Symmetry: none
Subunit: 77 residues, 10 copies
Amino acid sequence: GSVQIVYKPVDLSKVTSKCGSLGNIHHKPGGGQVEVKSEKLDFKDRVQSKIGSLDNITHVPGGGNKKIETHKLTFRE
Amino acid sequence: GSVQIVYKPVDLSKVTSKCGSLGNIHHKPGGGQVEVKSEKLDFKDRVQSKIGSLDNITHVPGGGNKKIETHKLTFRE
Amino acid sequence: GSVQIVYKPVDLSKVTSKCGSLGNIHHKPGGGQVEVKSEKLDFKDRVQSKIGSLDNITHVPGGGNKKIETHKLTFRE
Amino acid sequence: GSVQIVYKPVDLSKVTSKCGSLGNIHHKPGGGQVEVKSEKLDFKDRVQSKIGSLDNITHVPGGGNKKIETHKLTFRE
Amino acid sequence: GSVQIVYKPVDLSKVTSKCGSLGNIHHKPGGGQVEVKSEKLDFKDRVQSKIGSLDNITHVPGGGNKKIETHKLTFRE
Amino acid sequence: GSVQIVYKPVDLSKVTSKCGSLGNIHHKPGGGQVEVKSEKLDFKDRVQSKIGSLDNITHVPGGGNKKIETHKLTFRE
Amino acid sequence: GSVQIVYKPVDLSKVTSKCGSLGNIHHKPGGGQVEVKSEKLDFKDRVQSKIGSLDNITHVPGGGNKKIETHKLTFRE
Amino acid sequence: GSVQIVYKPVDLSKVTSKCGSLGNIHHKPGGGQVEVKSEKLDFKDRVQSKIGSLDNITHVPGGGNKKIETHKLTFRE
Amino acid sequence: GSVQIVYKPVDLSKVTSKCGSLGNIHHKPGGGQVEVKSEKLDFKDRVQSKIGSLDNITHVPGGGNKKIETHKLTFRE
Amino acid sequence: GSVQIVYKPVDLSKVTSKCGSLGNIHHKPGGGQVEVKSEKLDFKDRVQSKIGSLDNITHVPGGGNKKIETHKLTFRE
């Protein structure tokens, strides 16, 4: 029972940006208020929690390009 | 029982942007209010929670292009 | 029982943008209010929750182009 | 019982935009109010919940073009 | 039962940015307030918690490009 | 007496040629004979002059397209 | 006396040629003979002059298209 | 008397050629003979002059496209 | 009397050629003969002059495209 | 009398050539003969002169593209 698996994907991809000018961004929100009331917190196993947050994010990348690749080869018998 | 699997996808793709000018963005919201009341929190196993949030995000990438790729080869017997 | 599988998709695709000028975006909402009342939270197994949120997002990519690809080869016997 | 499967789709597709000018966007809503009352929350297994939200999104991509591709080859015996 | 697995994906990909000018970013939010009340915190197993946060982030990378790659070969018998 | 002049023309033009083959050009004129006997020519100021010309031109562009664009804003007083 | 002038023409034009083959051009004139006997020519100011010309032109563009665009804003007083 | 002049034209133009083959050009003129007997030529000021010319030009560009763009803002008083 | 002049043109232009092969050019003119007998030529000021020319030019660019752009802001008084 | 002049043009231009092969050029003219008998030539001021020229040029660029850009801000008084 000969089994041959040849896995050769070829990737010449290209994720490209060209920006001549990227300027004059103003991020001026008014002040916010967050009020969270609780009594008991009983987190267990795998919990990713986030309680009472106030984020002001100015994210200005020159490219900000992404390439996400994933190769899997699974072999049972 | 000879089994031959040849997996060779060829990818010459291209995700491209060209912006001459990217400017004059104003993000000026009024102030917000968030009020969350609770008593018990009993998270368990896999819980991704987010309680009482106030996000102001200015995301201005020059390209912001994405390419997401996924290859899987699964082989049982 | 010879089995031959040849998997060679060829991809010369192209996701492209050209913008001469991208400017003068104003994101000025009025202030919002969110009020969530509860008593018990009992999340379990896989729960992705989001309670009491107030998002102001200005997302201005120069391209913002996406390409999502997915290849699967499954082989049982 | 010889089985030959040749899977070679060829893709020269093209998702393209050209915008000369993309400007003068104003997103100025009035302030909103969200009030959610509950007592018990008992989420289990796979629940994607979202309670009490107020989103203001200004999404102005220069292209915003998408290409979604999906290849599957399934082989039982 | 001869088993041959040849895993040679070839990657000539390219995640590229070109920005002529990236300037004049102003991140001036109003002051925020966060108030979180609780009595008991009983975290266990794997809990990633974050309570009472106020983040002001100005993230201005010249490229900010990402490439995420993942190769897996799994072999049972 | 406020004066504002905004000058931002946008040009996404394209002057393009495609040729599959550009071959087999032969330029074999017979021998020319030019004899000029010029005396007392008295050119003055701005003068362009051709005297006794034998021009054998073979001009075979694969394209030869052209685009002349002229923009002019004039603010006198 | 406020004066505002906004000048933003947008041009997404395209001057394009396609040719499958551009071949087999032969330019074989017989021998020309030019004899000019010029005396006392007295050109002045702005003058363009051709005297005694024998022009054998073969002009075979695969395209030869053209586009002349003229824009003019004139604000006198 | 405030005067504001903003001059930001955007040019994403493209002058492009593609040729598959550009071959087999032969330029074999016969021998020319030029005899100029010039006396007392008296050129003055700005003069461009050609006397006794035998030009055998073979001009075979794979492209030959061109784009002349002229911008001019004039603010007199 | 405030005067503001902003001069920021953006140029993302591209003058490109592609050729697959550029071969087999032959430039074999016959022998030319130039005899100039010039006396008393009296050129003055700005003069460009060609007397007794036998030019055998073979000009075969794989491209030959060109782009002339002229920008001019003039603020007199 | 405040005067502000901002001069920041952005140039992301590209003058590019690609050739697959550039071969087999032969430049075999016959022997030329130039005989110039010049007396009393009296050039003055700014003069460019060619007398008795036999130019055999073979010009085969794989590209040959060009881009002339001129910017000029002039603030007189």
